[PDB]
Amino acid sequence: PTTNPPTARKFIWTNHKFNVSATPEQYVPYSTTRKKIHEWVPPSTPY
Amino acid sequence: RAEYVVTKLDDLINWARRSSLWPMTFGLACCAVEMMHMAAPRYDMDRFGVVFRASPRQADVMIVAGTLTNKMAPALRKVYDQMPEPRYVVSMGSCANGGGYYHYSYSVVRGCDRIVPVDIYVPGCPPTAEALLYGILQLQRKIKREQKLKIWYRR
């Protein structure tokens, strides 16, 4: 990639990171789901 | 000074354990074929001080290749519970990490990690022989960064 360099696309990284193994700056999963349920709203008004 | 002497001893104690680690003649599936291609003249274990000894008493790391069935499982922890205890583990494959195929079958454990504790996980269905080699170079620094005499001084 000096005489046949790639195409840059204005999202691709500039600072490449190695295999973050067991440090911080590693990966931890989610449940990227928006929680899919809604329980109830008790009022602050006794009777 | 005492700490500086102990950090270097604990850096010097590991150089032996990490260079001359003697893995164990395991097998069980396709994945083991790549270990042979890591004993092959392309990606040499022996160049890294890594030698197959086929007994655990002489061993320093288990490499778990292949589907760890329910019948083989006692023979896998009967074997992990036969080494000395600087013992390390490496799980080659997606059949050994989670049971990639056969995760939902009945005669397959859903991970080597159900049974023996593990230091590192190599993915790939047949992980390339240059992908265990990245792991047993990474296990070779995962205990470069162990501090077993430091945490004796401060204790």
């Binding site: 899919k36 349920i37 809604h38 329980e39 109830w40 709203v41 008790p42 602050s44 006794p46 009777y47 | -």
Partner: protein
């Protein structure tokens, strides 16, 4: 399109009234203990229930047999139905004695001032099916509706 409703404002945990007067969250071991205390205490005719709407035909019995073992018949429902003559008796005063399929096999329908269109919308469809195909005539009694 009401399946959005089963995931909103929906009760999950058993709540219980607090010493302040607000509702808190507790366990079944603590709520049933409080309810049972107020059932061994008051009995007979000061103990009642009002069912309504979206209710089984299984909890109606267990909630009936429970309150009959403390000798109560105050089992009521939200929407009124008569009792002056043979209300709960004789299962022909609160039913489609005709089959809903029977609307086809019919020449006349008197609709009292109700919307089959919006009360049980699909009893109006059999009427429309039997409005088109077999020459049927209807007479709606009260409340002109489109």
């Amino acid at each position: 399109f009401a399946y959005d409703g089963l995931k909103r404002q929906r009760l999950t945990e058993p709540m219980v009234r607090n010493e302040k007067g607000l509702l808190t969250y507790t366990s079944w071991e603590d709520a049933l203990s409080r309810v049972a205390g107020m059932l061994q205490n008051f009995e007979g005719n000061a103990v009642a229930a009002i069912a309504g709407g979206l209710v089984d035909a299984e909890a109606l019995v267990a909630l009936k047999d429970l309150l009959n073992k403390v000798d109560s018949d105050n089992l009521c429902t939200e929407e009124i139905f008569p009792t002056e003559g043979a209300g709960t008796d004789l299962r022909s005063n609160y039913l489609l004695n005709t089959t809903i399929a029977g609307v086809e096999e019919a020449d006349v329908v008197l609709l009292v001032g109700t919307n089959p269109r919006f009360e049980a919308p699909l009893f109006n469809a059999r009427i429309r099916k039997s409005w088109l195909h077999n020459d049927l005539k209807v007479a709606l009694i009260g409340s002109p509706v489109d």
